[PDB]
Design a protein around this ligand. Structure first.
Ligand SMILES: NC(=O)c1ccc[n+]([C@@H]2O[C@H](COP(=O)([O-])OP(=O)(O)OC[C@H]3O[C@@H](n4cnc5c(N)ncnc54)[C@H](O)[C@@H]3O)[C@@H](O)[C@H]2O)c1
Ligand SMILES: NC(=O)c1ccc[n+]([C@@H]2O[C@H](COP(=O)([O-])OP(=O)(O)OC[C@H]3O[C@@H](n4cnc5c(N)ncnc54)[C@H](O)[C@@H]3O)[C@@H](O)[C@H]2O)c1
Ligand SMILES: [Zn+2]
Ligand SMILES: [Zn+2]
Ligand SMILES: [Zn+2]
Ligand SMILES: [Zn+2]
Lengths: 374, 374
């Protein structure tokens, strides 16, 4: 008898920047018209959540983060039609209202209802459903999945296969889809081409997978943490190199081993230097570089337009260019059909309450993707 | 009678920066192995030529500029097979050696024998054929066409139709091709799309032509010089706007008149502010911005990677992505077949000796393209 009533559960709240998550008792208000309340089951730790912690990604505080999750619908608000109580769903970091210029554009996914452009830390109606210590807590990416119970908007949640292993498919909510899509959709890696992926975390590795599926001949993985090279090779990388083992700049290294540069480069870290390096390593006359990593807020790049005049294409994308609510269930369907494996990405599992340990694991470089089970 | 002997003629020499061309007598050495000596007939004044004069584009001085021309082959050096004495030809500012990684890549045109990346001011063998005041004069883009006679490398000259009107087709050597190609090949303007073209010079207007040819629904021409608007509209622009007539940034203006941005934006001026505004005016989620205009040397752009993260493609090209030796004769064939008209581009004609007047016309904005006849 929770429907229509305020739920009292636990969530990881971030009260201040650069501090540990505080597991506290919060209050989830029941879903409003066209909103959905979800009981979380599993949530992965993505670099993006870390960025907000470090103040790298600006978003209102206090807030409950988390965005790469999967759970069960507890209760539906007035007017919901796409999902109902008991449904296995994956909340979406980028929604699909289906009524905006972009949603109606078959080749784009950055819906206007997104809370990325101008982070408000609220649901689409401009209000919050969270309270903790008699104070309203903000939402994150409209979904806030670092909670046992979360109220999202109907267009920011996809109904998925009822037989879906929620502890694995949560990764399709952000990580896997982003990396894989970046290579398939965005870059459109062509068969026999040479690729370079900077960053071997969950998203980067997925990107190598995408490059492999796309039929790339050479897939060079780049990372300062050599302990990630094993997984890289496993997932499709033909060779892994470390920037620190070289005297010359990494881009000059990549150009040397590839006759002037790769056909496609990806930056899946979130740093300006590596974004410049990635762009610089693709051939000046035919290269395509894709920015996947999210850089620190307000830091700007300094670039010479001649880098593009010669013949390069520089582009970016969120969620790998997949229209969220529409493609997510399709990707889940593909997973259940043995199209791809997510096991390699998952290295650690921990109960939600040990959330801070998951972030420690990320900072140490021992983990790729850690799943928090509620 | 001139074959194998040094020819003495007149050329427009630039001895110093920010100074007038000095019409002096020069010595053109006969063509060496795989070289072609051409008697010029007509040459157009392109903004790139002006850039070198102002020191905005760095290249070795003293130098003989000119790169958008047409003439007749006077003689060929040992081993030439592609052209011969008496043939109408167009020298190529970007050669097509046909033996480099890029010449072999059917989708790229920036051949390695180009003298843009690391300007030497010499022919491909690293030497020069020009002497003036008993001093070695440098070449420009390997063709140096502001001279009655010039020696170029075989791979930097294309044989064209014998009936080709040289006083018009010279624009196909740089101006027209660059603008048209940017719209067709590079950007790949789609039918029913909305474009924005910054810069209504000969190159920008050709871009507009390309957009109309590609099937764009809306074509917004931007320029500070309103006297260009008539030609812009004549060539295909649906509307013309001047940045100076508004209070807010031109990109904010364009985004407002196009529901958030254009599908394709083109910068054909050569300034950092317009390159940033052009990128900004295309839709954040589906926009494609092409850099056509060459910015001042060493000046760097300051840009937030987030502008691409949302879903924008940024790219650039030289010669509109056309493989020079290959495509040039094809475009000439297209012209002879009435596929397109060049007349509109040509606003003034002057004899070679009055070269400085041409640059005066440019600086005043009364001219689009001025053709110097030898
Ligand atoms: N475009 C998107 O929609 C989208 C989606 C999800 C995540 N992201 C972003 O993608 C980026 C990567 O995410 P992640 O989840 O894979 O996180 P992650 O922290 O686990 O991976 C970072 C990886 O980069 C490596 N690395 C760090 N500095 C390096 C350097 N200087 N040179 C080479 N390698 C270095 C680290 O060792 C680690 O392997 C982050 O910025 C995240 O915010 C973007
Ligand atoms: N990529 C290439 O291969 C290639 C080839 C040829 C030329 N170009 C470059 O393209 C650019 C255009 O060449 P062009 O021959 O057509 O030059 P142009 O001087 O004839 O025209 C420049 C145009 O831009 C307009 N303009 C100048 N400042 C402006 C501003 N602040 N806002 C709006 N409009 C402004 C001028 O009024 C003029 O109409 C130059 O940089 C030239 O070097 C590039
Ligand atoms: Zn939408
Ligand atoms: Zn994420
Ligand atoms: Zn030019
Ligand atoms: Zn070549």
């Amino acid at each position: 008898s929770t429907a229509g009533k305020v739920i009292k559960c636990k969530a990881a709240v971030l009260w201040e920047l650069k501090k540990p998550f505080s597991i506290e008792e919060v209050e989830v208000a029941p879903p409003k018209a066209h909103e959905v309340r979800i009981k979380m089951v599993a949530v992965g730790i993505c670099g993006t959540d870390d960025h907000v912690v470090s103040g790298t990604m600006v978003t209102p505080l206090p807030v409950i983060l988390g965005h790469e999750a999967a759970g069960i619908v507890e209760s539906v608000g007035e007017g919901v039609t796409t999902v109902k109580p008991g449904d296995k769903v994956i909340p979406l970091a980028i929604p699909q209202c289906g009524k905006c210029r972009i949603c109606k554009n078959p080749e784009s996914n950055y819906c206007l209802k997104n809370d990325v452009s101008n982070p408000q830390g609220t649901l689409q109606d401009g209000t919050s459903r969270f309270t903790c210590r008699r104070k309203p807590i903000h939402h994150f990416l409209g979904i806030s999945t670092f909670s046992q119970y979360t109220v999202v908007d109907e267009n920011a949640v996809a109904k998925i296969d009822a037989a879906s292993p929620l502890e694995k498919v949560c990764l399709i909510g952000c990580g896997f889809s982003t990396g894989y899509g970046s290579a398939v959709n965005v870059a459109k890696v062509t068969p026999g081409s040479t690729c370079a992926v900077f960053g071997l975390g969950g998203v980067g590795l997925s990107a190598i997978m995408g490059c492999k599926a796309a039929g790339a001949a050479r897939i060079i993985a780049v990372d300062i943490n050599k302990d990630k090279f094993a997984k890289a090779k496993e997932l499709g990388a033909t060779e892994c190199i470390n920037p620190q083992d070289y005297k010359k700049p990494i881009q000059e290294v990549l150009k040397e081993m590839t006759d002037g540069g790769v056909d496609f480069s990806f930056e899946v870290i979130g740093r300006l230097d590596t974004m410049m390096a990635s762009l610089l390593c693709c051939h000046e006359a035919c290269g395509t570089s894709v920015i996947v990593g999210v850089p620190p807020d307000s830091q700007n790049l300094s670039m010479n337009p001649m880098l593009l005049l010669t013949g390069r294409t520089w582009k970016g994308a969120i969620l790998g260019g997949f229209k969220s609510k529409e493609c997510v269930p399709k990707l889940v369907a593909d997973f259940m059909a043995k199209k791809f494996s997510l096991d390699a990405l998952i290295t650690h599992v921990l109960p939600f309450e040990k959330i801070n340990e998951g972030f420690d694991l990320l900072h140490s470089g021992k983990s790729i993707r850690t799943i928090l089970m509620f």
